Structure formats: C-alpha cells, structure tokens
Design a protein around this ligand. Structure first.
Ligand code: A1ACB
Ligand code: A1ACB
Ligand code: CL
Ligand code: CL
Ligand code: CL
Ligand code: CL
Lengths: 123, 4, 123, 4
C-alpha cells in the first residue's frame, strides 16, 4: 500500500553527480593510462559488474586507488563515468568503438547493447 | 506521487 | 547529442538498496532513541537537507555515528530511510504524523508536501 | 534508450 515519488531516483542521481562535481565524499581514484578519475565506490558498484566484483572483495574493498587494464581508453572511461552519474551517454561515430570496449570490460550490459545496435545500423 |  | 537510458536512475537506486540490505560499504550508523540504522552517507545527503548539511561539515563528515534529536520516532525514521532507497513511502493513518515530523526535521520537502496534502484530505 |  506504498505511494511512490516518480522523480525520486532521478533526483538522487542528480545530487550524487553534484557531490562528484564538488569532490564531496569521493572515496576512490580510478587510474586509466595515467589519467585519474575520482568517484564514489557505491555508484561505481551500482553501475558496473566489474566494480561490483572489485569492491565486494575483502581485500580490494579497502583500496583508495584502482588501476584499470592499460588497453582501456581514458576518453571511453570518462564517457561511461558521466553516464553512470547522469543516465546520459555521449555516443559518437568517433568514440563508439572505445565506448563499447570499455563497457564490455566494465560489464555495463545496457551500454554494450546500445553500442552493438548503433554499430549494426552503420554496416 | 503515484500508486506504483 | 547524448542518448538517455530511461531506467538507469531506478536501476542505480535498486542496486544501492541491495548494498544496504547486505550491509555493503555502509559508512555511518544513525541512532534514533537507541535504535540503530546503517546507511550510506552519500544516499542520506542525496535525499535529505539535514544529512547534506551534516556530512558537508568539515568535522561531522568524519563521524561514523550520528545521534538524532530524542523527539524523532524510530518507526518514522525507518519509513523515511526505506523511501530514500526505494522511492516508496509507506504512509498510513497511524504513522502520518510521525512521518511528517521526521521529514520536516530531515528536510525532505517532497515527503512533507504529500503528508500535508493527505492530512488536509482527512479534515 | 531515448532522445532526452
Ligand atoms: C547482481 S546483485 C547487485 N547488487 C548490488 C550491486 Cl551494487 C550490483 N551491481 C552490479 C552487478 C552486475 C552488473 C551491474 C551492476 C550493471 C551490469 O550490467 N551488470 N549488483
Ligand atoms: C542543494 S545542492 C545539493 N547538492 C548535493 C546534495 Cl547531496 C544535496 N542534497 C540535498 C539538499 C537539500 C535537500 C535535499 C537534498 C532533499 C530536500 O528536500 N532538500 N543538495
Ligand atoms: Cl590504496
Ligand atoms: Cl549499463
Ligand atoms: Cl564517531
Ligand atoms: Cl523528499
């Protein structure tokens, strides 16, 4: 018999992004080919199967720095980190291959699906 | 607010 | 020119609630008249003007335990904490006064608004 | 996915 507030989840995510933009309560640095990205462990886990696995590990949960595979493109990561905090994906002809490869590595199934569809339309 |  | 995934914010919140239910990466205990509630500081800040003010304070941001005013009802708090993580509010005739008072104290403007409307309909 |  609950009532539901339609915009609550979107409003929560918007506020989490405001905390990220002001570097408030960020608890991890993600290193991608020397580029550094500050974020909230919980948001990374909520969006990515890879971060979920990493931060539920009894040893890795305590790390303040996580280094990604050297094949990961920093721009592809930046676009996906923006998507995690906003639901908006900046998908372009010039970045789609790097975005799909990064989403496959991060285990972000819905992003992988839209990249496969956009690539299939261009062939 | 809605009835979910 | 971004594309948007409609269910992303809801899916993020659902995963944050799963982390709460398994007590994963919770970083604060909220004490309400001896009852204890574990939560994520970021989610509390994203939902409440009071928690936003508390955890942006240079001294309080580092506290692992926060004690609420003794007038706050633990059931009212529990219903609001559930709303924060799910967008669902268990509003009932028997709890509406405790829920409205707790939402006013926590500074959760949309909850206060729906309580005022439901109370006005009953008079 | 939609055009926002
Ligand atoms: C599976 S239970 C669960 N509980 C809590 C969290 Cl934080 C979580 N995240 C997560 C796991 C797998 C995947 C994603 C997020 C996005 C994706 O495509 N795959 N999962
Ligand atoms: C105002 S900028 C901002 N930036 C980040 C966060 Cl985490 C935040 N939360 C917050 C502040 C005030 C209120 C709420 C949340 C809910 C409500 O009714 N009032 N605000
Ligand atoms: Cl470390
Ligand atoms: Cl995804
Ligand atoms: Cl403490
Ligand atoms: Cl609210």
């Amino acid at each position: 018999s609950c009532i539901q507030f339609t915009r609550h989840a979107s409003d929560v995510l918007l506020n989490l992004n405001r905390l990220r933009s002001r570097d408030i309560l960020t608890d991890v640095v993600i290193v991608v080919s020397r580029e550094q990205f500050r974020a909230h462990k919980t948001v990374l886990m909520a969006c990515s199967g890879l971060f979920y696995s990493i931060f539920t590990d009894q040893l890795k949960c305590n790390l303040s720095v996580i280094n990604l595979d050297p094949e990961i493109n920093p721009e592809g990561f930046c676009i996906l980190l923006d998507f995690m905090y906003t639901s908006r994906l900046n998908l372009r002809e010039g970045n789609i291959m790097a975005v799909m490869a990064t989403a496959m590595y991060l285990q972000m199934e819905h992003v992988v699906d839209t990249c496969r569809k956009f690539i299939k339309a261009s062939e | 607010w809605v009835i979910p």
